[PDB]
């Protein structure tokens with residue numbers, strides 16, 4: 001019955017702004033304080049801000065004061081987060097959370113999360129290099145933004161495949177390896193943000 | 204204000220009891236809450252008010268505590284319970300919430316040494332003007348593993364990054380890759396590239412290397 005749906009996330013450059021939305025349904029919105037909680041990559045949960053049930057009182061984590069503004073529109077049962085002067089460090093998944101019905105110091109329902117990526121990097125397709133019981137693979141290097149998908153032999157080879165989590169390099173571009181331990185081997189790489197598809201046969 | 208969770212990681216088998224604890228730096232006026240979180244998914248409320256199960260939370264989950272000590276107990280682990288758990292605190296005022304740094308519940312399994320492989324940069328990449336040397340540690344357990352890069356005997360520090368897969372769905376092992384980045388110019392200035400791996404399943408460090 002209860003549901004929180006977010007939207008608004010996106011990839012943006014430092015100094016730009018973004019505005020998050022969290023539409024509520026299944027409960028009387030106007031009665032609960034609502035919050036924004038984020039999770040930076042590989043980090044734990046970190047509280048961002050709160051707005052009282054009636055929208056009149058707000059409170060912010062020190063790291064966002066003066067830059068972010070939390071607000072709500074009870075007519076539309078929506079929670080907002082205006083994010084100005086964005087910094088690379090703000091990069092994280094942002095969740096909206098509802099104060100508990102049974103206990104308000106707990107968060108009983110959460111949004112599915114919306115991604116906020118702040119980088120001065122531009123969209124770029126990856127370069128695919130070969131990595132040659134034996135092991136072989138493909139180094140999918142220097143792309144932006146996430147994500148990229150990798151499959152082997154058009155998805156006909158799955159056993160023994162390990163596609164590692166992407167890594168953000170110091171250049172601001174991502175990189176990841178996909179290997180397989182073992183006849184032809186081709187890694188099918190696709191990076192949708194740049195409309196880049198590559199079938200790379202490793203010799 | 205500060206919730207300290209322990210242990211950082213818990214390695215158990217399905218059916219065993221998991222006990223996670225969370226300790227606050229001051230008596231909390233309001234009993235803690237616990238959340239379960241799977242990778243790439245929103246947290247899920249498990250317990251609130253220190254001991255009350257949230258909606259749809261099965262019986263095997265229980266909590267207790269008061270003052271500054273709170274614990275979460277999973278009587279008998281089910282396969283879906285291996286995830287990360289966070290404790291959380293919040294007062295009426297100030298209204299900010301605080302979170303523990305999380306406890307990771309992982310699947311125990313027998314020891315398995317990694318199979319190590321080293322990959323020199325491809326000629327294709329070298330044309331590109333960059334060099335990536337990759338070291339792969341395949342299907343090992345437990346998680347802790349140390350990778351050390353050496354170029355002509357010089358210990359490499361600060362120019363490598365590693366990535367680890369999630370526990371394998373079938374055999375519960377981990378796999379990890381470490382990528383050493385070098386300018387093409389420097390790559391060409393050295394000869395021996397070596398990846399030394401230290402792990403529980405290895406009686407002594409394993410080294411894979413190649414000669415440029």
Ligand SMILES: C[C@@H]1O[C@@H](O)[C@H](O)[C@H](O)[C@H]1O
Pocket residue numbers: 032033034050051052053057058099104294295296297298
């Ligand atoms: C913002 C507001 O502040 C207090 O009234 C309480 O902490 C309430 O739960 C919160 O929503």
